[PDB]
Amino acid sequence: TLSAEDKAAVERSKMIEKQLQKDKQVYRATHRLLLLGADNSGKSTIVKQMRIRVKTSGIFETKFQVDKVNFHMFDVGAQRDERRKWIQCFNDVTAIIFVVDSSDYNRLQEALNDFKSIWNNRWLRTISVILFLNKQDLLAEKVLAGKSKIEDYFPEFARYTTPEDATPEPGEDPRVTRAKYFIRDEFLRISTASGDGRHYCYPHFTCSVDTENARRIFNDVTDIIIKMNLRDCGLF
Amino acid sequence: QLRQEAEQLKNQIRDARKACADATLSQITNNIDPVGRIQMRTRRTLRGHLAKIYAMHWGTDSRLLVSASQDGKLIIWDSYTTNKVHAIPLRSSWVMTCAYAPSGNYVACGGLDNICSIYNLKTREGNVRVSRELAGHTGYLSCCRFLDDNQIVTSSGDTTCALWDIETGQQTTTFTGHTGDVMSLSLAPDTRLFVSGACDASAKLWDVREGMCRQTFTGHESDINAICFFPNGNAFATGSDDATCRLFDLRADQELMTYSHDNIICGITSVSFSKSGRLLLAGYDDFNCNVWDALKADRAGVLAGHDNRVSCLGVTDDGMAVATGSWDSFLKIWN
Amino acid sequence: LAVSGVLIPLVYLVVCVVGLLGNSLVIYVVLRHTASPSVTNVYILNLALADELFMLGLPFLAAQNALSYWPFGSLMCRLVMAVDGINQFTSIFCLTVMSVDRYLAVVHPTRSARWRTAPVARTVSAAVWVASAVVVLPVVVFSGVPRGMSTCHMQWPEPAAAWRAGFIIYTAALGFFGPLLVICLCYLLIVVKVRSAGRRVWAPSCQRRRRSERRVTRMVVAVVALFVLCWMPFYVLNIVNVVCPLPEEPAFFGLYFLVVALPYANSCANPILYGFLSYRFKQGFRRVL
Amino acid sequence: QVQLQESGGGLVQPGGSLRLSCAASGFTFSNYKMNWVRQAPGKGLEWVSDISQSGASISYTGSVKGRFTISRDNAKNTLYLQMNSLKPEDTAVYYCARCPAPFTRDCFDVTSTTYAYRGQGTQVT
Amino acid sequence: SIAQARKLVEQLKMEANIDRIKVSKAAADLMAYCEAHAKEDPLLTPVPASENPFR
């Protein structure tokens, strides 16, 4: 039979397993997202407006609650430009919210390249990506100004037409809608070049002040949940 | 300018290494008999982790081990009775490495956050609490190992390594010679020198007391992910994403033997040597681990059974069993 | 009889083998090359075992239909009948439990994750087997064996027609009404949830969300249609033969053989539907091939 | 040791032509994906084009699409880039980047400021 | 920007004065160290379960 020390060790192991199960309950009840974007993408604005500590901190966490569901968004902090190594730690995240400046025509193409690094990655190939085209008002103002031309950076924009399934917002210039849908299609082609059903993109238009985006993300996560429950049961 | 001086110095070093090269390791050690097929059986199976396990470390007593997973929990496993001894909750869930003190009194951890957390396991209340927090790095901590009960070396993603004093809590020695993100480092048996590999396709040797680089071995063609010291303290093996492991010698200053295969096109995640150093274990991205012959460069064994990417390997001090941790949140003991 | 009395049994064996073959294959993918131990894997293992136990009895029916008598004896006849019943009820209950588990995993993921584990799955399987025993064995131990010379049947009390109709209604109810009702309810709720989510999250870049939902829709439609065409006509023929004695006709023998083989056809198609068509097995087969 | 040597740049009038050549040493040229990027005076690193191992997947940026053409030589292990119809804004230092992981298609850290698998660059005007 | 190059050439000059040896001597030393502790390696030489606590 087991000695007293063995029985004490077994009881301690059982208590530790109970604590691990209690923590696993909350871990499964809470979702995790990864926020990514350029410096001018406006990530600081999305981190703020959360309606629910060292200087060299390399990771920031924002916890909020939408429809009684807890979401923790993680943002890269004091880290260098090399991201091919630590991003592999985010292989088990629910979604990657990637922000793109809609008005910055110079880095836009560059952002596209970065989007490829998020999509064609061998470790991020089975992770959903939610695209946030931030700064729509600035894009509208730049299109109404007419000083800068998109043809100087993207020539195919001169041979692009409005899609049939377009939904123009009430009170929006046609040129702004054309540019918005052109950027959307430019991102969607790169996304679907290697999608193959295992992952999809979530395009969402983000303005300066929008409080519903997070809720939208919730819905997106919900869809992801279904897309993670149908492949296990054997229906998708 | 001095770029031509650096080029001619590198050329002189290469010519000296070529002149000192007489014969390869496979040619001189070809007369010995091969080891053969190695069939290791699973003795113990550890279950209970939530997220993917990233690193582990064995103790000096060859009984207890520490396991670090990305769920924010450090678990102390008993290799004999499979019982959990301690469960340390972490403030940050995105951890990447863990360290076990030689005396078994402290346990270090770190990750994406630029803070190395050391917890004391010998608290007077029987529980575990935050004993020390070392901050100052500007990159993610990749690996850390203990040299004593008062000092600890840490490798960070900011291309620099730092020797911290547990009593004071400040950087005593800083190494900034690397160009890429230092991914792993291994301490020598005498705790005098240590080799560290970075993402610049090269590894460098550093001194604990002198605080200067000794030698540099590039060898590979891609980013080096792991590195382990030889039991004799004179050699070390490095694994990179190019699906090739390379053995270097500090005294020879050249590459000894290359372990690779045609059907292997996946990178190496972790490497470790046995007590004798004849067998070299390496985890690959093909969901399997391969044990090669360090002297013959032949596939001696395959430790298959993992349902996910192999993340970490660990060999005890006596070499009686080997722990393998993968992203499937399970640890397997092989013997 | 005619030559058909030799063609129907033999081919049966072949079909049986095919089914067995299929089952055997999934046996491997549930025992040796499994992707990850989960509740779905345990349910697939239980369903495969039930289908194997249900198909291994078809040679007995083939031998009984080929010959003019039953040489195995009344004890063996009782054992085979009890084993048929048990396998049949176990397969039906395992399909119902699979549907309930899919419903709980799709609609209420966090709520169902509290108890969706392997020990709970094994407990549910044991309860299913116990319920199958309780609904099969007390029924077969009460009815006698009307032999005459040598045959396989069931003896009812003095109200022979009344007790036969009662047993037919009982088995038809407990095999068709409840399980298929749960199937339809769970599948309809899952389809409604999927359609609502697809309409809510995002339309444009979903790459024809109609096609994204068409896979689940066709799977549900195929499962329901196969279940219907394999279970309903058998009990319908049974009840219309009980309430109305059919005249002697050679075509009625073939009709009876077809309506008896339809459950077996469903038992053979279940490994094809709940097996290779799943994402897990389809992505795990590429690791070796 | 990994080494990339780029050449073929010089003072060219607007509307000329150039043929940049990058020689690689220390690794297998045929088993890695290559990229050409540019850096303008006062501006950051800008990606230009990319080509895979077998040369089947070739992509260019929208700024130079239709004018530049990139090709590989596995026998000589040389990356060639023919640039036609040069523009004044095209004056930039061109760099060659190599993918960190073999047998992959994700070009991570190719536009990073500090990258080991990248040459010193050549002046192109 | 030249300070990094100066540090690099200084490190190269420091590493150039390292007393290196031949590969044959290191190979022989490694072979001797591997053959000396061959019996002390349970992984290299299997041992019965009477002494293995992982039985």
Q: What are the extents of the domains in chain B?
A: 2-334
C-alpha to C-alpha distance for A45 and A207, rounded to whole angstroms: 10
What the block records as the tokens of A26 is 């909350």
C-alpha to C-alpha distance for D68 and D65, rounded to whole angstroms: 7
Give the nearest partner residue to A110 out of D46, D66, D114, using CB atoms.
D46
Residues 6+ apart with CB under 8 A from C268: C15, C18, C19, C22, C51, C55
Half-sphere exposure of C24 (CA within 13 A, CB side): 7
Contacts of B278 in chain E (CB under 8 A): 34, 38, 41, 44
**Minimal-distance CA residue of chain E relative to B36:** E44
Half-sphere exposure of C14 (CA within 13 A, CB side): 5
Residues 71 to 110 of D: which have CB under 8 A from any B CB? Answer: 100-103
C-alpha to C-alpha distance for D18 and D82, rounded to whole angstroms: 6
The domain limits of chain C are 4-287
CATH fourth-level superfamily of B2-334: YVTN repeat-like/Quinoprotein amine dehydrogenase (2.130.10.10)
Q: Which residue has the tokens 């031309």?
A: A149
CB atoms within 10 A of CB E21: 14
Task: List the CATH number of the domain containing D15.
Answer: 2.60.40.10
What domain range is D18 assigned to? 3-98
C-alpha to C-alpha distance for B153 and B164, rounded to whole angstroms: 6
A84·D100 Cβ contact <8 A: yes
Residue D104 lies in a domain: no
What domain range is E18 assigned to? 2-54
Residue E3's Cβ-count burial label (10 Å; 0-12, 13-18, 19+) is exposed
The secondary element (H helix, E strand) that includes residue B249 is: strand B245-249
C-alpha to C-alpha distance for D102 and A28, rounded to whole angstroms: 35
E43·B16 Cβ contact <8 A: no
- Given a contact cutoff of 8 angstroms between Cβ atoms, the answer to whether B294 and B236 are in contact is no
Q: How many domains does chain E have?
A: 1
C250-271 helix and C4-31 helix, angle to the nearest 10 degrees:
10
Q: Is B21 on the interface with E (CB under 8 A)?
A: yes
- List the single best residue of B285, B286, B307 to mutate versus C (max C Cβ within 10 A): B307
A229·C109 Cβ contact <8 A: yes
Residue D121 lies in a domain: no
Residues 6+ apart with CB under 8 A from A118: A36, A96, A98, A124, A129
Residues 67 to 126 of A: which have CB under 8 A from any D CB? Answer: 80-84, 109-110, 113, 116-117, 120-122
Q: Is D88 on the interface with A (CB under 8 A)?
A: no
B180·A82 Cβ contact <8 A: yes
Contacts of B79 in chain E (CB under 8 A): 54
**Minimal-distance CA residue of chain C relative to B305:** C33
Nearest to A191 by CA among A112, A132, A101, A134: A112
Residues 6+ apart with CB under 8 A from D44: none
What the block records as the tokens of B66 is 């520490």
The secondary element (H helix, E strand) that includes residue E55 is: none
Percent helix, strand and coil across chain B, each to the nearest 5 = 5, 45, 45
Cα separations (Å) of B286 from B266, B282, C218, D28, E24? 6, 11, 35, 22, 35
- Given a contact cutoff of 8 angstroms between Cβ atoms, the answer to whether B56 and B100 are in contact is no
Residues 6+ apart with CB under 8 A from A86: A76, A79, B96, B112, B140, B157
Contacts of A217 in chain C (CB under 8 A): none
Side-by-side strand order, sheet with A69-76: A59-66, A69-76, A30-37, A95-101, A128-134, A201-205
Give the 3-state DSSP-derived string for D4-34, with helices as H, strands as E and coil as C.
EEEECCCCCCCCCEEEEEEEEECCCHHHCCE
C-alpha to C-alpha distance for B12 and A177, rounded to whole angstroms: 63
Amino acid C201 reads V
β-pair type (A95-101, A128-134)? parallel
Q: Is D113 on the interface with B (CB under 8 A)?
A: no
Q: How many domains does chain D have?
A: 1
- Given a contact cutoff of 8 angstroms between Cβ atoms, the answer to whether B240 and B220 are in contact is yes
End-to-end CA distance of chain D: 30
Physical contact, E and A (3 or more Cβ pairs within 8 A): no
The secondary element (H helix, E strand) that includes residue C159 is: none
C-alpha to C-alpha distance for B163 and B213, rounded to whole angstroms: 14
Residue D32 lies in a domain: yes
- List the single best residue of A31, A82, A94, A127 to mutate versus B (max B Cβ within 10 A): A82
Residue C34's Cβ-count burial label (10 Å; 0-12, 13-18, 19+) is middle
Contacts of A10 in chain B (CB under 8 A): 83
- Given a contact cutoff of 8 angstroms between Cβ atoms, the answer to whether C98 and C223 are in contact is no
Task: List the CATH number of the domain containing E42.
Answer: 4.10.260.10
**Minimal-distance CA residue of chain A relative to B116:** A57
Question: A: neighbours with 3+ CB pairs under 8 Å?
Answer: B, C, D
C-alpha to C-alpha distance for B335 and E51, rounded to whole angstroms: 13
- Given a contact cutoff of 8 angstroms between Cβ atoms, the answer to whether B83 and B102 are in contact is no
- Given a contact cutoff of 8 angstroms between Cβ atoms, the answer to whether B196 and B182 are in contact is yes
Contacts of C119 in chain B (CB under 8 A): none
Q: Is A191 on the interface with C (CB under 8 A)?
A: yes
C-alpha to C-alpha distance for C217 and A236, rounded to whole angstroms: 10
C-alpha to C-alpha distance for B326 and B331, rounded to whole angstroms: 7
Q: Is B307 on the interface with C (CB under 8 A)?
A: yes
What the block records as the tokens of A216 is 């939208």
A229·C105 Cβ contact <8 A: yes
What the block records as the tokens of B254 is 């050249």
Residues 209 to 238 of B: which have CB under 8 A from any E CB? Answer: 212-216, 230-232, 234-235
Q: Which domains does chain A have, with CATH numbers?
A: 33-233 (3.40.50.300)
Sequence length of chain C is 289
- Given a contact cutoff of 8 angstroms between Cβ atoms, the answer to whether B319 and B274 are in contact is yes
Which bin fits B258, alpha (ψ -120 to 50), beta or left (φ > 0)? beta
Q: How many Å lie between the alpha carbon of D118 and the closest alpha carbon of chain A?
A: 14
According to DSSP, the residues that pair with B248 across neighbouring strands are: B236, B255
C200·A25 Cβ contact <8 A: no
CATH value of C4-287 in 3.40.190.10, 1.20.120.80, 1.20.1070.10, 2.60.120.200:
1.20.1070.10
Helix/strand number for chain D, H first, E second: 0, 8
C-alpha to C-alpha distance for C138 and B164, rounded to whole angstroms: 76
- Given a contact cutoff of 8 angstroms between Cβ atoms, the answer to whether B137 and B120 are in contact is no
DSSP symbols for B314-325: EE-SS-S-EEEE
Nearest to B288 by CA among B274, B298, B299, B303: B303
What the block records as the tokens of E54 is 């992982």
What the block records as the tokens of A59 is 């990771």
Q: How many Å lie between the alpha carbon of C35 and the closest alpha carbon of chain B?
A: 7
D112·A82 Cβ contact <8 A: yes
Half-sphere exposure of B218 (CA within 13 A, CB side): 16
C-alpha to C-alpha distance for C42 and C119, rounded to whole angstroms: 10
Resolution in A: 2.7
Greatest CA span in chain B, whole angstroms? 65
The secondary element (H helix, E strand) that includes residue A4 is: helix A4-29
Question: D: neighbours with 3+ CB pairs under 8 Å?
Answer: A, B
C-alpha to C-alpha distance for C148 and B99, rounded to whole angstroms: 81
Cα separations (Å) of D103 from A119, B241, C3, D22, D29? 16, 10, 63, 21, 12
What the block records as the tokens of E23 is 């590969």
Give the nearest partner residue to D100 out of B179, B223, B265, using CB atoms.
B223
Nearest to E53 by CA among A148, D5, D108, B62: B62
Contacts of B307 in chain C (CB under 8 A): 35-36
Residues 6+ apart with CB under 8 A from B286: B264, B266
- Given a contact cutoff of 8 angstroms between Cβ atoms, the answer to whether C59 and C52 are in contact is no
